[PDB]
Design a protein around this ligand. Structure first.
Ligand SMILES: COc1c(O)cc2oc3cc4c(c(O)c3c(=O)c2c1CC=C(C)C)CCC(C)(C)O4
Ligand SMILES: [Zn+2]
Ligand SMILES: [Zn+2]
Ligand SMILES: [Zn+2]
Length: 162
């Protein structure tokens, strides 16, 4: 029982581009750019689509930095989140109806305004290290338990529908 998602972090030496959910689910929180991988699309096309729709940005390449598994108490279906980062972007960041991109200096990242798991794996991301992580949520604000480990290479899931 799982659903397939992507998350894209736009990362430059001194700054990260985040985006603010403007309405609906998760409104008021800054996040990377991502969403559900659609049927008929590959993981990486979905990551590119999320970034393009939400930030208006195109990228030359995505690095696979991480895999996050979310579990929500009472829900049997896990979220399988493929995490990517990109250094080199093309276009000017512009908001959609869903998301507004904004640059943040790395030491200014607004963790109180982001999802609670970000405080865990963001240090590994900014150190340019790959990771695998798991977070058990109760509601939106509460992590019941977590496992986070640095990895040498991101484990490939061999999704053959995506
Ligand atoms: C990657 O962005 C996140 C994230 O960091 C944490 C998230 O946590 C959630 C917890 C959650 C629920 C959630 O939908 C989330 C998240 O979606 C969530 C997300 C967003 C996931 C992506 C941008 C791929 C619904 C069930 C409930 C019991 C309310 O708990
Ligand atoms: Zn599928
Ligand atoms: Zn990167
Ligand atoms: Zn997967």
């Amino acid at each position: 029982a799982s659903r397939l998602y992507t998350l894209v972090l736009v990362l430059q030496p001194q700054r990260v581009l985040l985006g603010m959910k403007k309405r609906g689910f998760g409104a008021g929180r800054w996040n990377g750019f991502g969403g559900k991988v659609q049927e008929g699309e590959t993981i990486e096309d979905g990551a590119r689509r999320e970034l393009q729709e939400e930030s208006g940005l195109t990228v030359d390449a995505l690095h696979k930095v991480g895999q996050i598994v979310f579990e929500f108490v009472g829900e049997p279906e896990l979220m399988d989140v493929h995490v990517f980062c990109t250094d080199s972007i093309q276009g000017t960041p512009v908001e959609s109806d869903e998301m507004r991109p904004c640059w943040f200096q790395l030491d200014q990242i607004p963790f109180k305004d982001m999802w609670p798991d970000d405080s865990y794996w963001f240090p590994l991301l900014l150190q340019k290290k790959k990771f695998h992580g798991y977070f058990k949520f109760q509601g939106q604000d509460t992590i019941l338990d977590y496992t986070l480990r640095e990895v040498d290479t991101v484990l490939e899931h061999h999704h053959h529908h995506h």
